[PDB]
Amino acid sequence: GSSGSSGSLRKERARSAEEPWTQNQQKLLELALQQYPRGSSDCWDKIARCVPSKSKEDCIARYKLLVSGPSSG
């Protein structure tokens, strides 16, 4: 765009802001989503516990995709 310094942020692997989910994390979460269903902000706070890699906030940001995806049977 226009020659500017301050503004929005650009994606970059280096930053590693939104790291991927390993077979483990993806699992620890799923299994959790079952034990700690929707409810109070605390409900999730617990889900993040089973995930020593991702945090509560991340757990919720991942759920959207988990529920926003097709699944046969």
Swiss-Prot record:
Phosphoserine: modified positions: S8, S16
Basic and acidic residues: bias regions: 8-18
Localisation: Endoplasmic reticulum membrane; Nucleus membrane; Microsome membrane
Limits of the SANT domain: 16-67
Self-association state and partner proteins as the record states: Interacts (via J domain) with HSPA5. Interacts (via cytosolic domain) with ribosomes. Interacts (via SANT 2 domain) with SERPINA3; the interaction delays the formation of the covalent inhibitory complex SERPINA3-chymotrypsin, but does not alter the catalytic activity of SERPINA3. Interacts (via SANT 2 domain) with ITIH4 (via C-terminus); the interaction protects ITIH4 against in vitro cleavage by kallikrein.
Biological role: May modulate protein synthesis.
Name of protein: DnaJ homolog subfamily C member 1
Full-length numbering of the shown residues: 484 to 543 of 554
